[PDB]
Specification:
The structure is a homodimer. By secondary structure, the first copy, chain A, is of the alpha+beta class. The first copy, chain A, has one domain: Roll (Nuclear Transport Factor 2, Chain: A), CATH 3.10.450.50. In chain A, 20% of the residues lie in helices and 45% in strands. Chain A is built from three helices and seven strands; from the N terminus they run ααββαβββββ. In chain A, strands 1, 2, 3, 4, 5, 6 and 7 form a seven-stranded mixed β-sheet that branches. In chain A, strand 1 and strand 2 form a beta hairpin. Chain A is globular, with a radius of gyration of 14 Å. Chains A, B: This is DUF4440 domain-containing protein. Chains A, B: InterPro entries: DUF3804 (IPR024525), NTF2-like_dom_sf (IPR032710). Chains A, B: It holds the Pfam family DUF3804.
Chain lengths: 128, 128
């Protein structure tokens, strides 16, 4: 299957209620970081720690729209997408709609997420 | 010279008081977008329009620290950095310190910026 499809399969797994929290632990490269809207990095364990809280629960997440996909040579790729989520935090439901830039690399012939930066969650879809 | 150095030379030109506004017009690929902290995209002209305002003036900008650099094959690259700027907006000076994820591609044997997403400007350097 096409690399878009392979990489999209990985992003769908990230955007899943059961798998998001621990995902980077299994699927990310060792030097992966997740860049929060503040600019402050989290590593795979830091990301999982956020979701481990108890106070933060993912209700739904989806790959709403892919804005950019391309291979960067044979063994890397960029995928830019809008991630649409619903989550509960300390007693309130929230919608979240960031723009996310993700980078993938092939390691031992398998695709892994190498980098991800997200925006604040009130993006305007109409601009795409 | 090394690709880091070539790509760093391009980023220094972006982070310059005279060149930032119009930079993407000359140095970016046609499908480049700049992702604002909100997640909302700007194209090269949209970016220049912001700086054309009169109300917004860049006083200084620097590549403060490079956190990640690597080639993605022979003809692409990722560079993650903290951009330290001072700017005036509608009568007030501000400091700005985002995390920026940039992607580069070689087009006709020349490096061009292909993508850039920035965070809010109050990142915590101590986390790197």
């Amino acid at each position: 299957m096409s690399s878009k499809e392979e990489i999209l399969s990985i992003l769908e797994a990230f955007a899943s209620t059961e798998r998001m929290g621990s995902f980077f632990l299994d699927n990310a490269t060792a030097d992966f970081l997740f860049i929060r809207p503040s600019g402050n990095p989290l590593d795979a364990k830091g990301f999982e720690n956020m979701w481990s809280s108890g106070d933060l629960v993912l209700e739904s997440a989806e790959i709403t729209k892919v804005h950019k996909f391309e291979l960067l040579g044979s063994n890397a790729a960029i995928c830019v997408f809008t991630l649409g989520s619903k989550f509960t935090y300390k007693g309130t439901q929230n919608d979240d709609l960031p723009t996310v830039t993700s980078i993938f690399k092939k390691i031992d012939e398998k695709w892994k997420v190498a980098w991800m930066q997200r925006s604040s969650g009130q993006s305007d879809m109409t601009l795409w």
